[PDB]
Symmetry: C2
Subunit: 145 residues, 2 copies
């Protein structure tokens, strides 16, 4: 393995966080569909699939560095929200937690002088920041102020 175990575990943790992200967006879709919001459910379904490509990017990086992936149990997500804005605000809050979690790994890899992982994570935060901004675009679009 050409990464430290500490970094491997953090990346594996993050991969599992991307999986939970995908499941949370699917659960938001079950809520939107239960309320009849077909189009917003479809947005959530495509976002759930986008989250799986995030998990597979971490998957591929870990094996490239000689690590292995270990899948953990997935927590039951919430199944109800109080309207569209309420669901998308919960997603914004979740993606901000995800963005900070990735910045934490990048700090760790930087302290270890793990240049390859620093490069990987620097590239990925740019995609995470735009996925967060996609959530903000919806909230701004519905801002019925």
């Amino acid at each position: 393995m050409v990464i430290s175990e500490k970094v491997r575990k953090a990346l594996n943790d993050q991969l599992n966080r991307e999986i939970y992200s995908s499941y949370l967006y699917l659960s938001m879709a079950t809520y939107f569909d239960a309320e009849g919001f077909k189009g917003f459910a479809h947005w959530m379904k495509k976002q759930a699939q986008e989250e799986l490509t995030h998990a597979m990017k971490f998957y591929e990086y870990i094996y490239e560095r000689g690590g292995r992936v270990e899948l953990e149990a997935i927590e039951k997500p919430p199944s109800n929200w109080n309207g569209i804005k309420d669901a998308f605000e919960a997603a914004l809050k979740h993606e901000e937690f995800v963005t900070q979690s990735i910045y934490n790994i990048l700090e760790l890899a930087s302290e270890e002088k793990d240049h390859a992982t620093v490069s990987f994570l620097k590239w990925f935060v740019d995609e995470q920041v735009e996925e967060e901004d996609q959530v903000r675009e919806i909230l701004d679009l519905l801002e019925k102020a």
Copy 2:
């Protein structure tokens, strides 16, 4: 809702079982990849994606009948096997469990005289049976 609650819950149980199927196959891929078995990992990754379309078919049927889907926690799958055959035999046994679970929902829908759900499950079980036979084909290919 034009299905009974016990039927909706059985279909919802099955949906979550398909999710766990997808996760198990991804876990087998993490094992195959750690062993360097790249082509078999790719098989498992495709199969995991196939399992998500199974989940979404139960998803679509539940809402069509006026029900709702509730996602449950997914249990941690095993992460290690003792070789290729060992992993695929585990997959076969899981798919045989899945096949019997679908047959049990069929018996329940048929005693309720839920003709729409009986039709749905007869259609789907044919797909489940070919996915089972896909696993058997790999085991037969690797035999002895």
